[PDB]
Amino acid sequence: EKKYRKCEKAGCTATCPVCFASASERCAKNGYTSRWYHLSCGEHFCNECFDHYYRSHKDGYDKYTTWKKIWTSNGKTEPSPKAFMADQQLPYWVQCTKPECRKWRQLTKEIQLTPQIAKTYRCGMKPNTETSDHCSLPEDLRVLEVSNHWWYSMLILPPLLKDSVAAPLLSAYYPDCVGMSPSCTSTNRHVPGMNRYFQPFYQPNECGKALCVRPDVMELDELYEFPEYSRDPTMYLALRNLILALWYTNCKEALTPQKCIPHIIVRGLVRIRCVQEVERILYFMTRKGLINTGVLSVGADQYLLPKDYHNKSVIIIGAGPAGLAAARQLHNFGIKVTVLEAKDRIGGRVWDDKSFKGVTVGRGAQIVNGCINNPVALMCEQLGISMHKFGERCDLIQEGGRITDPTIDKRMDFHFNALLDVVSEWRKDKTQLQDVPLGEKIEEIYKAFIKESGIQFSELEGQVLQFHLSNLEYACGSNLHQVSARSWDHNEFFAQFAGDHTLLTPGYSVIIEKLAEGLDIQLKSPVQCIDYSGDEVQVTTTDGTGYSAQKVLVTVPLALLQKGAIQFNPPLSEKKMKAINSLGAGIIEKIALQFPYRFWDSKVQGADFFGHVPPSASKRGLFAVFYDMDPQKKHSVLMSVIAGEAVASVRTLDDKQVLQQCMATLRELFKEQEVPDPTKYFVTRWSTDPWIQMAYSFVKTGGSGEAYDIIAEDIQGTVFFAGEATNRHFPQTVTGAYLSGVREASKIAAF
Ligand SMILES: [C]C1=C([C])[C]=C2C(=[C]1)N([C][C]([O])[C]([O])[C]([O])[C]OP([O])(=O)OP([O])(=O)O[C][C]1O[C](N3[C]=NC4=C3N=[C]N=C4[N])[C]([O])[C]1[O])C1=NC(=O)[N]C(=O)C1=N2C(=O)[C][C]C1=[C][C]=C(Br)[C]=[C]1
Ligand SMILES: [Zn+2]
Ligand SMILES: [Zn+2]
Ligand SMILES: [Zn+2]
């Protein structure tokens, strides 16, 4: 039998392979063997130790055969002596936890690495236990080899993590397909204590859930950033999944490399590569706003990105959700940020009234549509505040006081949705130039349906159909004759936020105020001119005050871009202006009313809301739904909404006149009983608020959902745009505005 002292692998860098296993009595140690089996450039085992586990007549056979059965029934990865060695016998490596040392040390071969050892190890210490003489000793020369790409090229098998925090969430997958060891009994065993709104991973073959990630497939931007994992994403996926599991396990503190490291358990020098890589992936995911986000705050010298990203300055225009999200992100990253806000307050279309006894009443936004993976739900968790999931019951009460039978409600809802299905079919073969107003198409289809079918609706059924029409006008922010039939629901092409629809009972202002805390925000500083013709951006407010920065982020409402209230030099492009003008500045208003007692309790019986059947088409959208603003049923505040054509009818009414129409409406809805006078109220005027002039965007006839992407496109890597009218997947909402700010901070930090 011929024996060799060199590695089996052509080009291996080990000039003298030594056996890490020493499992056989005849282990070749550092000498000659019939084959030196290669795991990495630094790790080899001799043929005697190979046979020790592999051959049926040898001592190690039962342990290998036992491992092999577990491996093949739990994973898709082939068993082999090399796979066994890497999973069960290869020694562990650990970093000294002395902060000024951090050197990599090999543990003796019977020590099994735990998070506790990784948190407490110091050079030369017996694991699980004075002078720093041992720290000065050089690292094993194989340690430095690991930081080269060629070392990864020469590693024969991907690493497989043990006891990953992500494993309880991934039991539907083969563990090795997500970078976890099939032999782990804890991996192969609702995550207790994890917020039920945090569902970061798609289940197999699952789609259609906003902000979920496939645990078994890399996304294109991950591959662009880490092309070394394109052939085999195993090792990247385990680290990214681990990072996400750790972040959602404790979203109230910054997830750092040092916090991840004890949770990376895997044998061999590859652990060094895993620890180096998890730090790079963490910064990539931090920049993108996937972790270390929300209302997390850092102190100075505790910034979330390394000093490389810090050498920038930004001016942010507008302190609503999008602007404050960008400002918080960039500030946390370590980038200089100044926020210029036109009004005397922050929040934009978030504006909460705190003067009603016992409740908080939003003048603007207050609902969260779809809490699962929603950053608003994350921020509620971070702040320790609760949302109220809406109940389904909403009786449609008529003027005169009768309650509409629920089968009428459902039947006319059925007919209305069927009208929308015909629009959905009609538009399939239509170009933008062939677009038609949604409301016009609905009316045409309805009239054809009546003529064709001969059906005769009662007056009440027709009024209930008007109710459902007004709900769609509310959702679009407009009468439907301005809304695109092709594009009105364009964003539903994309995965939407699943789960509960809630009332944010403490109000979005709590989140707004925490985002803004400690930031440099200039109030009463409306921007008039943005000049990016020079080496730095020059921003001038209406009183002549100048600000400068390398980059500028514009988050003003769609209506203010349409009016051109800010002059741009050089001007916005024709293509950008066409997109801006293709979207509609939708609008609703709100009224809130406080009463001496809950006069509606006997009739409404604890429902979250009740509907108002419009008595005529001229009154469609006028107080269509009344919201009980105390889910705990103690205080007496109702809120109602003005939508569609009704917005134009209240434009020329003062607040007292609107209040009078609302009280006359309520006394009709509760005709059979007494209704007390309200003791406090507000009527919103968003449509004439000079720096807002809207509630939320929609696509106008002839427009495309692509307009949202076009408005979001940066100019020259210098002028950036965020805001609800820049979020194609998630238009209109505080959530989409927030995410658009996170998106732009990511773009800005990448330079
Ligand atoms: C108004 C309203 C109402 C009444 C209601 C509601 C609403 C609203 N919503 C919406 C929201 O809110 C929005 O979207 C947001 O807020 C947005 O954000 P942004 O984008 O950030 O914006 P703003 O806020 O507006 O902010 C901006 C700012 O900027 C400023 N400026 C301007 N200009 C200027 C300035 N500065 C300086 N310079 C210059 N020049 C202004 O001032 C401002 O501040 C909503 N949302 C949600 O999410 N939720 C709710 O609840 C809401 N709402 C209602 O109610 C309903 C609606 C909806 C829902 C659901 C869905 Br799916 C959709 C929709
Ligand atoms: Zn050996
Ligand atoms: Zn080798
Ligand atoms: Zn040390």
PDB file of N, CA and C and ligand atoms in Angstrom, residues 96-98 101-103 105 121-124 132 134-136, ligand 4:
ATOM      1  N   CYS A  96     -11.607  34.902  21.763  1.00  0.00           N
ATOM      2  CA  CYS A  96     -11.442  35.504  23.075  1.00  0.00           C
ATOM      3  C   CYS A  96     -12.428  36.655  23.232  1.00  0.00           C
ATOM      4  N   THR A  97     -13.063  36.739  24.401  1.00  0.00           N
ATOM      5  CA  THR A  97     -14.041  37.796  24.644  1.00  0.00           C
ATOM      6  C   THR A  97     -13.440  38.985  25.371  1.00  0.00           C
ATOM      7  N   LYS A  98     -12.133  38.998  25.577  1.00  0.00           N
ATOM      8  CA  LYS A  98     -11.458  40.225  25.975  1.00  0.00           C
ATOM      9  C   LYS A  98     -11.572  41.216  24.822  1.00  0.00           C
ATOM     10  N   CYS A 101      -8.608  41.881  22.548  1.00  0.00           N
ATOM     11  CA  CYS A 101      -7.934  40.689  22.041  1.00  0.00           C
ATOM     12  C   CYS A 101      -8.708  40.102  20.864  1.00  0.00           C
ATOM     13  N   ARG A 102      -9.798  39.391  21.148  1.00  0.00           N
ATOM     14  CA  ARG A 102     -10.696  38.843  20.130  1.00  0.00           C
ATOM     15  C   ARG A 102     -10.035  37.769  19.270  1.00  0.00           C
ATOM     16  N   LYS A 103      -8.909  37.205  19.704  1.00  0.00           N
ATOM     17  CA  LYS A 103      -8.203  36.246  18.865  1.00  0.00           C
ATOM     18  C   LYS A 103      -8.967  34.929  18.777  1.00  0.00           C
ATOM     19  N   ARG A 105      -9.227  30.976  18.816  1.00  0.00           N
ATOM     20  CA  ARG A 105      -8.552  29.855  19.465  1.00  0.00           C
ATOM     21  C   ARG A 105      -9.296  28.548  19.208  1.00  0.00           C
ATOM     22  N   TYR A 121     -15.435  33.073  26.845  1.00  0.00           N
ATOM     23  CA  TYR A 121     -14.112  32.511  26.606  1.00  0.00           C
ATOM     24  C   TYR A 121     -13.026  33.580  26.677  1.00  0.00           C
ATOM     25  N   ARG A 122     -11.881  33.204  27.238  1.00  0.00           N
ATOM     26  CA  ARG A 122     -10.675  34.020  27.189  1.00  0.00           C
ATOM     27  C   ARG A 122      -9.486  33.114  26.921  1.00  0.00           C
ATOM     28  N   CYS A 123      -8.507  33.640  26.175  1.00  0.00           N
ATOM     29  CA  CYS A 123      -7.363  32.837  25.741  1.00  0.00           C
ATOM     30  C   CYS A 123      -6.779  32.056  26.903  1.00  0.00           C
ATOM     31  N   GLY A 124      -6.515  30.774  26.662  1.00  0.00           N
ATOM     32  CA  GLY A 124      -5.889  29.923  27.658  1.00  0.00           C
ATOM     33  C   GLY A 124      -6.756  29.508  28.829  1.00  0.00           C
ATOM     34  N   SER A 132      -3.222  38.104  31.381  1.00  0.00           N
ATOM     35  CA  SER A 132      -3.455  38.061  29.942  1.00  0.00           C
ATOM     36  C   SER A 132      -2.209  37.644  29.172  1.00  0.00           C
ATOM     37  N   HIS A 134      -1.668  34.700  28.008  1.00  0.00           N
ATOM     38  CA  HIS A 134      -2.125  33.845  26.918  1.00  0.00           C
ATOM     39  C   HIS A 134      -2.694  34.629  25.746  1.00  0.00           C
ATOM     40  N   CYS A 135      -3.186  35.847  25.973  1.00  0.00           N
ATOM     41  CA  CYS A 135      -3.763  36.608  24.874  1.00  0.00           C
ATOM     42  C   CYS A 135      -2.691  37.040  23.874  1.00  0.00           C
ATOM     43  N   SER A 136      -1.472  37.313  24.343  1.00  0.00           N
ATOM     44  CA  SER A 136      -0.414  37.785  23.455  1.00  0.00           C
ATOM     45  C   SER A 136       0.080  36.720  22.485  1.00  0.00           C
TER      46      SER A 136
HETATM   47 ZN    ZN B   4      -7.327  36.752  24.421  1.00  0.00          ZN
END
